[PDB]
Design a protein around this ligand. Structure first.
Ligand SMILES: OC[C@H]1O[C@H](O)[C@@H](O)[C@@H](O)[C@@H]1O
Ligand SMILES: OC[C@H]1O[C@H](O)[C@@H](O)[C@@H](O)[C@@H]1O
Ligand SMILES: OC[C@H]1O[C@H](O)[C@@H](O)[C@@H](O)[C@@H]1O
Lengths: 360, 247, 247, 360, 360, 247
């Protein structure tokens, strides 16, 4: 039993199966890539020009379309049957084509959702999240992770297919692949929800879409208590609300003493003033301001609310979810071929309209 | 532009064109292609920023069973070259103009690759004729020739765009009004909805919608990064599959 | 107070009284009734604040099978009117005094509605006597008369409270000492425990306690709003029900 | 087959069934509302004063108590058999009463927890959370959401009941409603836990309940290094701890140079001083202070700890959970009628006691 | 039927069974503790020196090793059979030894992971988390919680064992103990993941391990717009980018007026300058700075990135997870006896190497 | 040092030594022993800080079936005494020197307790000889004597360390170079991994790894405390067990 493929020949076959595409056609899909992958085995088996070489080369000139990554098991099975047919065994010429057709369909049907729609979107999304800051860590991450996964999958699956021969059908089977498909679908749905929430920004701030600003209060925001000729005071214990309807407060200077003893607001001794009108903030006034901002008080006298604030108070990603479901309905009902480009143009026009209207 | 930068851009565009059909090393993805083109022509941070912005759109741009995708390769390469020619990288111009141009060039690349993969039928017939003589060299040469033609499909437009004077392209890119640029920037935060929505439409069931909504609800927890949410999704899937397989 | 404000308050109180038995448009809930009464008499923010504060207490105040609830309708209407009459809306006075007064007026409204729904027996007997003659008009009129009486049950006390001079009610409300008002404000943050606890007691099982504790544990994640937590509960329930129905 | 109810008549019937209550009694519960709902159908069928009209009116004067929202299926089924009995069919007179009694019980038992104890608490809680800021979005949200759900449910369920007739019992059945009940109970338990955690505030700060304040450290909080005659310095590399037990540091002025070279603390060259004693904070001292506060350092020289701080360190909502379980045990042991009001009065007295004791 | 043990004798027996260890041997494990626990029962039953006392004392001088906490059921069962053998019942002498051996094994196998590996690590971790700040709440928490659980378990399980006699085997059995073990293991794995993430700090800041700092931008960080001779301005609306490639801006002074009208950057009217070079920050400049820091902008002109920052951007706890799995592999492959100490010494040497290399 | 502090430390060390074999009141755990020793000798915060730092290492230090653990008792007691003697508690010196010394003293205590638990065989044989005479007093006294010997096993080294002059131990502790101390402090954040890994290795399965990874992923949510995560783990386990028992 001569003509035994070595490890180096199998590695070369894998590196050539890296070129499974390139001669991609519409009537005989992805057929030359298989031959280019299995060229070294045929070269080792039969010399060029022979009738055996003619038959071997013509055998693999049939339609063969599969997800490129999950084809290494097919290549390994083909290498095994090529070794068997080069060792004087009876396996019929159509058996290799039959097994190739058999594992062409289901393997691709599993490969497309797992690789193109689950692994690639996740890796690319992580890479883009890293790339938002313009850092080289992101292309490095994408290239290294994706290529490590691809090389490992190709090499180990080709080795498994070559070792197992036609028996790999008894290992793949049904139900086994459906668990992977369902798990990948669960992970993809979760990640797609996360991506829709985090990466669809439709901020509605604008110069319109601003709800009326509420004067707030007289101390609910960051500010000091200015009195007539400067100086910063603090509200003391109430001495008793007057019958008119205004409470009288103690005005303690920022030393512990007491002075003034008037009413709180404009006409009284002191009134609340935000940081804008403050001058010479040096001293303990900065400490008080820092304490106030650490408490959580805003710096604006009027609480300005936008449409984005209302939407966020409802739930962040409200408009993103509405847009997602609208686009989903449009895609499910249109059933066209150029519909995605039309929807993209539509949202570009929608963004133009929103910007010119002052909403977004 | 420097001459060495020109050769580097040509090789990167050739690699992106090769990968557009190969789909193995992912040199055609915007995160790789735009970053490489920015690296070649000096400023690299802008290239990585554009690649990250365009990768969200390029998600769900896989081709299955003679249904060719919008071809992120030419989009990435041409958009990166166009940005490089126009010396402005404010990240508002990137979203406003470079991304719609990327979408249009993606459609153009889709039609170009459709033409090339139709034209490859004659090359494959010639390879079959060579294999009729029992020669490995002939079939290998024809396969490599078709692969080279597919790479040239994106190498050539890159050279054509590079031949355009910098002054003319800068003037054309600046002439776009400010208001329409800002509107397109606003819509650029929306256009990823279509890309997400096709992937959602491909896999969606009454059983799997709760997971989508759970991921949507847990997203505002910014202390969990994207890899953290990936591991969370994997463990959630594992627990769900275990509890389902118990019965 | 403005005359138009008086008519608006009377109409709103009548609507709340009707809804207290109708339980359809929820004009009797504090979030609606207090906000409407604040809208009528100028200041609206205080009305909405009091309505929101009182709605948490009003949770679990449904009436089932001849077990009449504490009647949030009269509580909301009378508390809003009393707050309006006293020109002070510091949100410390709202929790200190207006909420205990709302609870007491809720008990009073419960006894008043008990009396009215007992008195409706004679009206229904009259309607049966009319139906003995085969006339739709008689039974419709008697039904509308009972409905009008139930609405008047809360319309009349609102008018009585409105007749009270502003000076006297302000003096009575201001006479409350500061320490007891602050203590009642402190207890106002606890009184919602009873309202939550009845709802918990109605629906609680060894199987459902873990979900209560899960919701309690996940609550400090302030990045998730109440609608987010509602969607989270819905998806958790969906996943649990799916995994339970698998077996 | 004449006497066919139209869409407008059914819409009027639904809007009248909105008044299912109002004539609420104790011996014949909620009986006139059904007749007021079905008046238009009887008016279209039989003219007033006839014996047929008298019998029809007397038929629907029996006890009928159900959750008001889940009664539209009953009204639709009643409309169906009213059409049948007006078309010369031999349905027995007691059949309508039998079916009404049949769906009276289970429908109410399902609708009571779903609507009054699950949907209403959730919508009201969301409305109150939005209303905490005194915004009109909250009453609008409550009214719009609740009424949209109610109108949609009433109209669609009445249409379904009218279309299905008595066959709706084969659609409701058992087990089907238990799934909705269990899901609603799960959601309600989750939301009630969230509400208890977020909306029971028993803050134990007080003037009492303050644990002793630790002097902290000499740089663990926000502050500068003051050296006698003004100026702000930075600690340098240690030159070697002295044998007495005090380490020597390098005092760098905020320019890079070296001045003083003494020991750290009071008697030395410089000592740590918080922002209160700082004057003329202008310059890079503000930048240093902002960096410190961004790090997370507090502004107080003494780390003041409260009882609320201890409880939160254990777990937020500790006292809320304890009160919840105490109230639950009281409720399941008392078995009274006015127990809730007594517990509310007790909690108000407890709050008064806590406030007067300085705890809360 | 005399010789009935009282509640006080049982309490004394439990307090003595607290001393189940202390006379711990290698050939007859934990044998004297059982006798010291059951001494009062034998003293009440038989007077010292009798042959009955001799046989009773020699009976419990055999090997008996169990988890100390789950031994109270064994002690109660032993007390039950001791009462029976002191009441003229024909229970064979070896029955007590047989039942003790029977519940020696499974009870210890269940209690070892529940108590030593689940309850104790959790309580100790919570105590250490509370103790990080040097607060007495942590030792108090550990002592009180652990001892309350221990006393409750011992007393109630001893009472249950005494009440049930030998029938406790029909209650423990199998299955339910596996459920408890699985739940405890789930909780322990979750808590161990949390502890590994939160309490393994390997911060890689260092003087080395600093990635090159990017100049950032001209306004992406906290700073003001300084123009030559003091004053702070704000960028206005663009008047049109010049053909050279520099945009012209309006320089609005912080009052609303327009001054200068030059270009943005160094040679122009104004340039961006961080808080370090600012002097006399008094006024509205502090308000602008506080707004900027509230937005989220950093205070450094150059964005400095560490290796720890990159690892955190990937996922927090990356190095901790890698170390955890490396140590797990080492422990699974070495199969030595002093391996943990060698690994700990290796980690200390690794920390020394990282510190001297400037990485960690 | 004050004399009363000396007797307090002696009794605390004796209690820790007794509990090292008793394992009931957990006086031997660092969180208790170090805090008590800090209480006796003035400064308490440093003792509790050391106890908390050392308890993470002491996790997974249980002894099962004649496999004696690293004996946290002597480690805690001796490390606390050594820190007390050296008047420096900067929390960098605590992690740099006191924790590696605690590990070494843990190994020493393990060998010492191995010797004592081997020596107890003769005591138990003497107790058996006494029980041959049917005397409860003899066996009780021999059990108490073995317990006293085991307590003395850690009481005696504490007294020996206390006898060492303060100046000599301070000089020996200060002589350690700065760089090695900082490196040991760095490794102190790693050394907890070893104990965590033993605990994981004792209990780990393909079914339980997802829960470990879920806990790892959810940890960055700092709003949930350790008790919150404990309750979360309990409810997760309860829900998982319910859903598994459905089938
Ligand atoms: O699945 C069919 C297969 O067809 C082609 O080879 C490529 O588009 C693949 O990406 C795809 O998976
Ligand atoms: O469930 C019985 C039913 O009785 C009355 O009609 C009302 O109180 C309803 O809210 C309740 O649901
Ligand atoms: O499990 C056997 C048992 O042996 C000894 O008593 C101690 O080490 C215990 O901690 C252990 O549980």
């Amino acid at each position: 039993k001569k003509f035994s493929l070595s490890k180096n020949t199998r590695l070369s076959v894998m590196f050539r199966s890296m070129f499974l595409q390139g001669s991609w056609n519409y009537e005989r899909m992805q057929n030359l890539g298989f031959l280019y992958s299995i060229i070294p085995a045929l070269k080792q088996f039969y010399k060029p020009g022979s009738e055996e070489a003619k038959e071997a080369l013509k055998r693999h000139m049939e339609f063969f379309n599969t997800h490129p990554y999950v084809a290494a098991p097919i290549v390994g099975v083909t290498l095994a049957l090529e070794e068997e047919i080069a060792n004087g065994v009876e396996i019929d010429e159509a058996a290799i084509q039959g097994v190739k057709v058999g594992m062409m369909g289901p393997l691709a049907g599993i490969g497309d959702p797992v690789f193109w729609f689950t692994v690639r979107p996740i890796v690319g999304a992580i890479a883009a999240s890293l790339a938002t800051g313009g850092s080289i860590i992101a292309p490095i991450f994408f290239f290294v992770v994706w290529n490590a996964i691809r090389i490992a999958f190709l090499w180990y699956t080709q080795e498994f297919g070559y070792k197992q021969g036609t028996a790999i059908t008894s290992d793949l089977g049904g139900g086994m692949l459906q668990q992977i498909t369902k798990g990948a679908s669960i992970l993809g749905m979760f990640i797609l929800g996360v991506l829709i929430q985090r990466w669809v920004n439709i901020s509605f701030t604008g110069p319109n879409a601003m709800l009326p600003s509420k004067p707030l209060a007289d101390g609910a925001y960051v500010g000091e208590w200015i009195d007539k000729a400067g100086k910063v005071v603090v509200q003391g214990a109430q001495t008793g609300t007057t019958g008119d309807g205004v409470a009288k407060f103690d005005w303690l200077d920022q030393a512990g003493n007491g002075v003034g003893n008037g009413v709180a607001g404009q006409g009284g001794f002191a009134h609340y003033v935000t940081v804008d009108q403050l001058n010479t903030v040096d001293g303990s006034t900065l400490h008080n301001i820092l304490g106030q901002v650490s408490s959580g008080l805003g710096l604006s006298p009027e609480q300005t609310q936008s449409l984005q604030d209302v939407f966020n108070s409802l739930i962040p990603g409200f408009i993103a979810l509405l847009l997602t479901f609208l686009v989903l309905w449009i895609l499910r009902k249109w059933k066209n071929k150029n519909a995605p480009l039309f929807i993209i143009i539509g949202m570009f026009v929608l963004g133009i309209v929103l910007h010119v209207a002052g909403l977004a | 532009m420097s001459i060495i930068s020109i050769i580097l851009v040509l090789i990167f565009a050739f690699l992106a064109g090769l990968e557009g059909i190969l789909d193995q090393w992912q040199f055609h993805q915007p995160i790789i292609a735009c970053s490489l083109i920015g690296i070649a022509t000096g400023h690299m941070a802008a290239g990585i920023i554009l690649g990250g912005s365009l990768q969200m759109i390029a998600l769900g741009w896989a081709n299955v069973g003679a249904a060719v995708a919008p071809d992120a390769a030419l989009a990435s390469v041409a958009s990166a070259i166009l940005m490089v020619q126009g010396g402005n990288f404010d990240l508002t111009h990137i979203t406003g103009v470079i991304v719609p141009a990327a979408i249009l060039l993606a459609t153009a690349g889709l039609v170009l690759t459709t033409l090339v993969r139709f034209l490859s039928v004659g090359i494959v017939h010639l390879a079959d004729a060579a294999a009729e003589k029992g020669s490995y060299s002939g079939v290998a040469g024809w396969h490599m020739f078709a692969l080279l033609l597919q790479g040239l499909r994106i190498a050539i437009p890159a050279a054509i765009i590079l031949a355009i004077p910098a002054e003319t392209v800068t003037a054309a890119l600046n002439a776009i009004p400010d208001w329409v640029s800002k509107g397109l920037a606003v819509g650029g935060g929306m256009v990823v909805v279509v890309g997400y929505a096709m992937v959602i439409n491909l896999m969606a069931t009454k059983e799997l919608w709760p997971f989508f909504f759970l991921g949507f609800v847990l997203a505002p927890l910014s202390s969990i990064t994207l890899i953290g949410m990936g591991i969370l999704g994997v463990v959630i899937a594992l627990i769900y599959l275990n509890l389902s397989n118990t019965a």
